[PDB]
């Protein structure tokens, strides 16, 4: 929201926590929604 | 024979991690398509999801 | 037509951090999120909080689960609004309801 | 003439966060702020922690309160100095005086 | 010939913060760093966690210490992994070992 970048493929980010633990972190986020318009276009034959 | 900066070592750890998340994400990216055009039925289910 | 009252998504009542933990669940029926918890009497396995066992609240559920779910995630820290909590029916007295989490970091705000 | 000591305010001991929470209180007299508290036995209503009931220390008040104070604000996280917090004299044994807060996230540093 | 697998050490289980504190301890033998502990039932003195009583594990150590160590530095928040933490053989049923830190910000992953 702060960059208005909710709509994207992926999302990199880096940050760090303060206090006597000096620890950075890296963070990646995305919402994979892979779909197919014609589901019956393909026939999944389980060969035997 | 030739050591280096732990700080630069920190950078290399950072970049290898970067490649790690990229590969991990792309791996589920293929998994989604595998389920999709392998069954036409799919379950996006995991812990904390 | 009809009324359209919609509310935002912030159950938090304070800027205090909220922390979660995962533990194997032993439910007997479906339990949606924000459901309190007990440990059993003998196996002390995870079940939903009854509302009658004093001090037995051990966690508040994070995501919806059921008896099929072997393990569950539950919030463990911070303060949350009373209005958003799904209190059990046996928890009939608010005077004893507010301090169900006595001795724990989960708090009602 | 006469010299006076102007000293800073350092109740904390380390950079750990300090969190507050509210719950209705059932005091028996005036209770100054930053005071140990337990719950009762029958209704487990909020009261000041006596100093003799082991394992009952669960909270440290935030604002001074009384009979008219229906509710209490109290600190739930962090570590605070040994010296600064005022305890009942019934807590007469020092070794259990440190360990009164067993199981709690609030600590004595 | 020789294999020295350069592996890392990540006792922290999740990015949630871990808090530390100190308190006098009454151990009976050497206690390896980051080891579960209880409070005594007689004098309420810091003791080693037996692994037999459920829900009495209250703290995890920070630095190496022995029974000679009068005071102990121990962690009281955060999440840590299944693997890195050391358990006595007394705690044998693993699902029981899951809920040793129930009610505490110290959490198992």
UniProtKB/Swiss-Prot annotation, chain A:
Superkingdom of this protein's organism: Viruses
Compartments reported by the entry: Virion; Host cytoplasm
Subunit structure: Homomultimer. Interacts with FI protein.
Family, per entry: Belongs to the lambda phage major capsid protein family.
Function: Assembles to form an icosahedral capsid with a T=7 symmetry. The icosahedral capsid is about 60 nm in diameter and composed of 415 major capsid proteins. The assembly is primed by the interaction between capsid assembly protease and portal dodecamer, and major capsid proteins assemble cooperatively to form the procapsid with the help of capsid scaffolding protein. Major capsid protein forms hexons and pentons of the icosahedron. Viral genomic DNA is packaged into the procapsid through the portal vertex.
Protein name, per record: Major capsid protein
Curated annotation (Swiss-Prot), chain B:
Protein localization: Virion; Host cytoplasm
Highest taxon, organism lineage: Viruses
Family: Belongs to the lambda phage major capsid protein family.
Subunit structure: Homomultimer. Interacts with FI protein.
Protein task: Assembles to form an icosahedral capsid with a T=7 symmetry. The icosahedral capsid is about 60 nm in diameter and composed of 415 major capsid proteins. The assembly is primed by the interaction between capsid assembly protease and portal dodecamer, and major capsid proteins assemble cooperatively to form the procapsid with the help of capsid scaffolding protein. Major capsid protein forms hexons and pentons of the icosahedron. Viral genomic DNA is packaged into the procapsid through the portal vertex.
UniProt protein name: Major capsid protein
Species annotation: Escherichia phage lambda
Gene: E
UniProtKB/Swiss-Prot annotation, chains C, D, E:
Any one of the GO CC terms: viral capsid, decoration
GO biological process: viral DNA genome packaging
Family statement: Belongs to the lambda phage gpD family.
A family per Pfam: HDPD
Quaternary assembly: Homotrimer. Interacts with major capsid protein.
Species for this entry: Escherichia phage lambda (Bacteriophage lambda)
Keyword Translocase: no
TM stretches of this protein: none
Recorded name of the encoding gene: D
Regions of compositional bias (Polar residues) in chain numbering: 1-17
Keywords annotated in UniProt: Capsid decoration protein, Capsid protein, Host cytoplasm, Late protein, Viral capsid assembly, Viral release from host cell, Virion
Coiled coil region boundaries: none
Name this protein carries in UniProt: Capsid decoration protein
Record region (Disordered): 1-27
Subcellular location: Virion; Host cytoplasm
Function: Stabilizes the expansion of the capsid head shell after genome packaging. The packaging of viral genome in the procapsid triggers a dramatic reconfiguration of the capsid shell, expanding from roughly 50nm to 60nm while the capsid thickness decreases. 415 capsid decoration protein molecules cooperatively bind the expanded capsid, thereby stabilizing the mature capsid shell.
């Amino acid at each position: 929201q702060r960059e208005g970048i909710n709509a994207s493929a992926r999302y990199p980010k880096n940050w760090v926590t303060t206090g006597d633990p000096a620890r950075e972190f890296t963070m990646i986020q995305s919402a994979p929604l892979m779909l197919l318009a014609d589901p019956d276009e393909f026939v999944s034959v389980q060969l035997a | 024979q030739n050591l280096a900066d732990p700080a630069y070592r920190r950078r290399r750890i950072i970049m290898q991690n970067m490649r790690d998340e990229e590969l991990a994400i792309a791996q589920v990216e293929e998994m989604q398509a595998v389920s999709a055009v392998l069954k036409g039925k799919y379950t996006m289910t995991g812990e904390a999801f | 037509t009809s009324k359209e009252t919609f509310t935002h998504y912030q159950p938090q009542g304070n800027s205090d951090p909220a922390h979660t933990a995962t533990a194997p669940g032993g439910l007997s029926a479906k339990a949606p999120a924000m459901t309190p918890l007990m440990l059993d009497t003998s196996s002390r396995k995870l079940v939903a909080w009854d509302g009658t066992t004093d001090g037995a609240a051990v966690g508040i559920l994070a995501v919806a689960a059921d008896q099929t779910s072997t393990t569950l995630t539950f919030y463990k820290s911070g303060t949350f609004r009373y209005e958003d909590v799904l209190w059990p029916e046996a928890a009939s007295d608010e005077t004893k309801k507010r301090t169900a989490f006595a001795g724990t970091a989960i708090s009602i705000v």
